[PDB]
Amino acid sequence: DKKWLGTPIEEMRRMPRCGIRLPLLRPSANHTVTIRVDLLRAGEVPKPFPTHYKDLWDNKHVKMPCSEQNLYPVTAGSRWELIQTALLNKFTRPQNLKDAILKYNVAYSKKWDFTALIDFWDKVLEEAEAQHLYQSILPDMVKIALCLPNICTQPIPLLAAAMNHSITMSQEQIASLLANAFFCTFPRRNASSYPDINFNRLFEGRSSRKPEKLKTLFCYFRRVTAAAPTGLVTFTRQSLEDFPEWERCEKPLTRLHVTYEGTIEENGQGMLQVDFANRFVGGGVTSAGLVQEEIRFLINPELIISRLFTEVLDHNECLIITGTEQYSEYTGYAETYRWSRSHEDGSERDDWQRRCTEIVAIDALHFRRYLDQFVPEKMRRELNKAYCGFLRPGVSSENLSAVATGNWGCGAFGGDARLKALIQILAAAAAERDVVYFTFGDSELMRDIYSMHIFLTERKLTVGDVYKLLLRYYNEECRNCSTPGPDIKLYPFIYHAVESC
């Protein structure tokens, strides 16, 4: 019968109800705020601050396509003026859009393949859908792109490695920026520690995934150019310098809800939603990937702009994004992913007019050899990564939502689900958060995670006791194991070890 086990999900803390009343929104050395805070009002489009466009062109800020420093060889010409010229033409065929984008990307005229764009327009859409795309959606997208200097007036700092810094910007500013990314306008982003931002890889090859990606993104573009979204989104890079001594951590485990049904994004509303991220945030979203991270970034595209400014994550870092809106629904996953329909996001907004949706990008390690992940160094790494993603310095536990997650770094990256579940349970306990864990049809893993959790909680083991058990497993079954897998599985080992004692 049972579709879930443990603590009822109803009993887990959610935003906005668990939330702290926010401090007043204001810019500081660690918080860039790109709108008029004095004028922020529910239901109104935020007004950019400053009033007039200010340009920085340096290695600490985004290089804006509308910068006077964005030049091209004629004698230098203004590449911004060239962009305007190229994009302010009627498109009636996909080649027209390709050629427009190539006018200010001349160096890529042989490298960039547009097959997926051509096939989407010509071979996937119905004739009327194609016509709507080129008569309405694309010209609307061009106009919001070309409005960039009136919309994004404030230089945007890069979130570079080791910085602890936030950027709070409007959904409207994001929309403008992403339309630019679609038209591949961001300079010096094509030719190494930053993800791709321009959408050029979205247009290449013949993956059956590409039409679904494109439909999902057009769903967003149609929505945000028809009526400006009125909210804000904050991006925070978080870097911890000190990590727990896990073997000494005396904290108790927290509560668990575990289910083989539901999704993170729908069932975990209001909770801290894990993005199973690439270290290059968004991974394959505007190229060939389509698993958990790429899906979330497609259905909540404001996530994608993190790639404009977020340097590759180091082992002690994460990215926390608050306020992204869901614009699409889907079915399937990976090679069966399909766009279903438009989504009307019902989420409340906090006092900064952010949707009460908090997502954290934590990248797992890739394990070439399965046993490599049980090495103490590798276990501590994953614990500390997840801990960084879950910890909110200067917030009490009662104000912290549950963590909504699942088999983080399992699948392509070769992670063990039962290990990673326990790692996350320990990270969460240390950060004083409950765990809501989704196994996506895998009912045996639901029961196993549940049985281990209740076992350890009833015997009141601490984070440190459990971590020492993981060390014993490494020392006794892994370190001098003759074979690809060890003699005894982790969970059975832990049950025998504690029941022994």
Q: How far apart are CA 144 and CA 183, in angstroms?
A: 11
The answer to whether the CB of 400 falls within 8 A of the CB of 392 is: yes
**Measured from the CB of residue 295, what is the shortest distance to ligand M1D in angstroms?**
6
Taking CB under 6 A as the rule, which mask of x and - marks residues 318-347 in contact with ligand M1D? ---------------xx-------------
Q: How far apart are CA 341 and CA 307, in angstroms?
A: 25
**Measured from the CB of residue 417, what is the shortest distance to ligand M1D in angstroms?**
10
* Given 119, 196, 212, 275, the catalytic residue: 275
Residue 126 among the catalytic residues = no
User: Rule CB under 6 A: which of 39-98 touch ligand M1D?
Assistant: none
Q: How far apart are CA 170 and CA 184, in angstroms?
A: 21
Instruction: Establish whether 267 is an annotated binding residue.
Output: no
- How many other C-beta atoms can be found within 10 angstroms of the C-beta atom of residue 251? 14
Residue 294 among the catalytic residues = yes
Reading the block at residue 346, the tokens are 């019902």
* Given 196, 212, 294, 382, the catalytic residue: 294
CA atoms within 13 A on the CB side of 416: 19
Side chain identity, residue 120: F
Q: How many residues bind ligand M1D (CB under 6 A)?
A: 7
Q: How far apart are CA 122 and CA 307, in angstroms?
A: 30
Residue 413 within binding range of ligand M1D, rule CB under 6 A: no
Instruction: Establish whether 246 is an annotated binding residue.
Output: no
**Measured from the CB of residue 263, what is the shortest distance to ligand M1D in angstroms?**
5
Reading the block at residue 251, the tokens are 């904290």
Instruction: Establish whether 265 is an annotated binding residue.
Output: yes
Side chain identity, residue 432: E
Instruction: Establish whether 95 is an annotated binding residue.
Output: no
Specify the residue, 253 or 321, whose C-beta has the smaller distance to ligand M1D: 321
Handedness of CA 219, 221, 227, 233 (dihedral sign): positive
Per CB under 6 A, the list member of 280, 413, 440, 455 interacting with ligand M1D is 440
DSSP string, 17-51: TTPPPPPPP--BTTEEE-B-GGG--TTSPPPBSSS
Instruction: Establish whether 480 is an annotated binding residue.
Output: no
Q: How far apart are CA 176 and CA 64, in angstroms?
A: 12
**Measured from the CB of residue 44, what is the shortest distance to ligand M1D in angstroms?**
34
Specify the residue, 265 or 325, whose C-beta has the smaller distance to ligand M1D: 265
Specify the residue, 15 or 264, whose C-beta has the smaller distance to ligand M1D: 264
Q: How far apart are CA 301 and CA 181, in angstroms?
A: 12
Residue 311 among the catalytic residues = no
* Given 212, 293, 325, 350, the catalytic residue: 293
What are 31's strand-pairing partners?
Answer: 28, 166
Per CB under 6 A, the list member of 263, 267, 340, 462 interacting with ligand M1D is 263
Q: How far apart are CA 46 and CA 52, in angstroms?
A: 15
Specify the residue, 334 or 498, whose C-beta has the smaller distance to ligand M1D: 334
**Measured from the CB of residue 335, what is the shortest distance to ligand M1D in angstroms?**
7
User: Rule CB under 6 A: which of 278-297 touch ligand M1D?
Assistant: 292
Side chain identity, residue 408: W
Residues that bind ligand M1D (CB under 6 A): 263-264, 292, 333-334, 406, 440
Residue stretches of the annotated binding site for substrate: 264-265, 278, 292, 333, 407-412
The residues that are catalytic are: 275, 293-294
